Amino acid sequence: TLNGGITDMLTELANFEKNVSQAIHKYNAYRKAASVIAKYPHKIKSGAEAKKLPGVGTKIAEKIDEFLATGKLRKLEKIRQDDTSSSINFLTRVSGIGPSAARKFVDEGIKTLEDLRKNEDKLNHHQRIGLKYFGDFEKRIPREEMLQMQDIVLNEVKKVDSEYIATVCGSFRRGAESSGDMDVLLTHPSFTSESTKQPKLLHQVVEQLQKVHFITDTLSKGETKFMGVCQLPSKNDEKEYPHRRIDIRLIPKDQYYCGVLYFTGSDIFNKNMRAHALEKGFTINEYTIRPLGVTGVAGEPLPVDSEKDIFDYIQWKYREPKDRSE
DNA sequence: CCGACATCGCATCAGC
DNA sequence: GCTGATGCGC
DNA sequence: GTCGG
Ligand SMILES: O=c1ccn([C@H]2C[C@H](O)[C@@H](COP(=O)(O)NP(=O)(O)OP(=O)(O)O)O2)c(=O)[nH]1
Ligand SMILES: [Mg+2]
Ligand SMILES: [Mg+2]
Numbered sequence: 001t002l003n004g005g006i007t008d009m010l011t012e013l014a015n016f017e018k019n020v021s022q023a024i025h026k027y028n029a030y031r032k033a034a035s036v037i038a039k040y041p042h043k044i045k046s047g048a049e050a051k052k053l054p055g056v057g058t059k060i061a062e063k064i065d066e067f068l069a070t071g072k073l074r075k076l077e078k079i080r081q082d083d084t085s086s087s088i089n090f091l092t093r094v095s096g097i098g099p100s101a102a103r104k105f106v107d108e109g110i111k112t113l114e115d116l117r118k119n120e121d122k123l124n125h126h127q128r129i130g131l132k133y134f135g136d137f138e139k140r141i142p143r144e145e146m147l148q149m150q151d152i153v154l155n156e157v158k159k160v161d162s163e164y165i166a167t168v169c170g171s172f173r174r175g176a177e178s179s180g181d182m183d184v185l186l187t188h189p190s191f192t193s194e195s196t197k198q199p200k201l202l203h204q205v206v207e208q209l210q211k212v213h214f215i216t217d218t219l220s221k222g223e224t225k226f227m228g229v230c231q232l233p234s235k236n237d238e239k240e241y242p243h244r245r246i247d248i249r250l251i252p253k254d255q256y257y258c259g260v261l262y263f264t265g266s267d268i269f270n271k272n273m274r275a276h277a278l279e280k281g282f283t284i285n286e287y288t289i290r291p292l293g294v295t296g297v298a299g300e301p302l303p304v305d306s307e308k309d310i311f312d313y314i315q316w317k318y319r320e321p322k323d324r325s326e
Numbered sequence: 327c328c329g330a331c332a333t334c335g336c337a338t339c340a341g342c
Numbered sequence: 343g344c345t346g347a348t349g350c351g352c
Numbered sequence: 353g354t355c356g357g
C-alpha cells in the first residue's frame with residue numbers, strides 16, 4: 001500500500017492484457033513489475049527510480065511518470081470507456097469464464113450478470129457454479145476462518161485414515177491475514193512416485209468432506225487435483241458464512257517438499273524461482289527438480305529432503321514462506 | 327536485435 | 343474409444 | 353513488456 005496506486009494501475013493493465021488482449025506474456029510482465037514495486041521499501045518518486053527495479057522497463061517507467069503527475073493513466077481511462085473491454089473484464093470474473101468464453105459470450109450478446117443468470121443453459125458445469133457463488137467468491141477469508149476451516153479438513157482427513165497428511169498451503173502458509181481460498185496438499189503413504197497401492201485416495205477424502213457437508217460443490221475432480229466449494233457451518237440464528245473456493249492436490253508422498261514448495265507460492269514467486277532454476281540449468285515442477293543437459297530435455301529427479309535442498313540446488317538463500325509473498 | 331518468458335491437471339471438443 | 347489441441351485455474 | 357546474449 002506504500003506504492004499502492006502504482007501497483008493497482010499495473011494490476012489493471014495486467015488484467016487487460018490477459019482477459020482482453022489475450023497476451024499472456026504482457027500479463028505476466030505487468031504482474032512481475034507490480035510485484036517488485038510492491039515490495040520496494042521506498043515511495044516511488046519517478047519512473048526512472050522505478051526503472052532501476054528488474055522487470056520495470058521503459059514503457060512502465062513512463063506510465064509511472066504519467067500516473068505520478070496526474071493521478072491516472074489515459075490508456076486506462078480509455079480502456080474503461082470501451083464497452084467490449086468492460087464486458088470482457090467483468091465476465092472473466094466468473095470462475096470458469098476465461099478470455100475465450102468471455103469474448104464468445106459478448107458476441108452472443110451475453111454481457112451482464114443478468115444475461116448470465118438467464119442463459120444458465122449456455123454455461124458448462126464449472127461456469128454455472130462460478131456464477132452461483134459470484135459474490136461469495138469475491139470475498140476474502142479472514143485467517144480466523146481459515147483456521148476454523150483447517151481444523152475440519154485435518155480432522156475429517158484423519159477420520160478417513162490416520163496415515164493421510166493434509167497441509168494448508170497457499171497464502172495461508174505464507175502467513176497472510178486473509179486468503180482468496182484454501183489450498184490443501186494431501187499425502188498418503190500408499191501413493192508414492194513408485195506405486196499407487198490404493199485407488200480413490202482423493203475421492204475418499206472429498207467424500208468425507210461432502211458427507212459432513214463441508215464441501216458443497218465440485219468444480220473439477222480427478223485422481224489428484226480437486227477444485228470445489230466449501231462452507232463453514234453456522235450457529236443457531238447466525239447468518240451463514242459465505243461459500244469458499246477450495247483446492248486439493250494429492251501428491252506422491254516422497255515428493256512432498258517439491259509439492260509443498262509449489263503449492264505455497266506465491267505464483268509469482270514460483271515463476272521467478274523456476275525461471276532462475278532454468279538460468280541455473282534446472283527445471284522445477286511440483287514433483288521434482290531435474291537438471292538440463294544441453295539437449296534441452298530434463299534429466300533425472302535430484303534427491304530432495306527439504307524445501308531448502310531445492311533452494312540450494314539453484315544457489316539461493318532459503319526464504320521462509322512468509323518471505324515468498326511476491 | 328530477438329527468442330524466451332513456469333509448469334501441469336482436468337474439462338471439452340474435433341478428428342479418426 | 344483414443345489422441346491431441348485448447349481453455350481455464352490465478 | 354522486459355530481459356539476456
Ligand atoms: O498460476 C499459478 C497459480 C497458483 N500457483 C501456485 C502457488 C500458489 O500460491 C498456489 C495456490 O494457488 P492460489 O490460486 O490459491 N494463490 P494463493 O494461495 O498463493 O493466494 P490466494 O489464494 O489467497 O489469492 O499454487 C502457481 O504456481 N501458479
Ligand atoms: Mg490460495
Ligand atoms: Mg487455490
Ligand code: NA
Binds near residue numbers: 052057
Ligand atoms: Na528495470
Ligand code: NA
Binds near residue numbers: 092
Ligand atoms: Na474466470
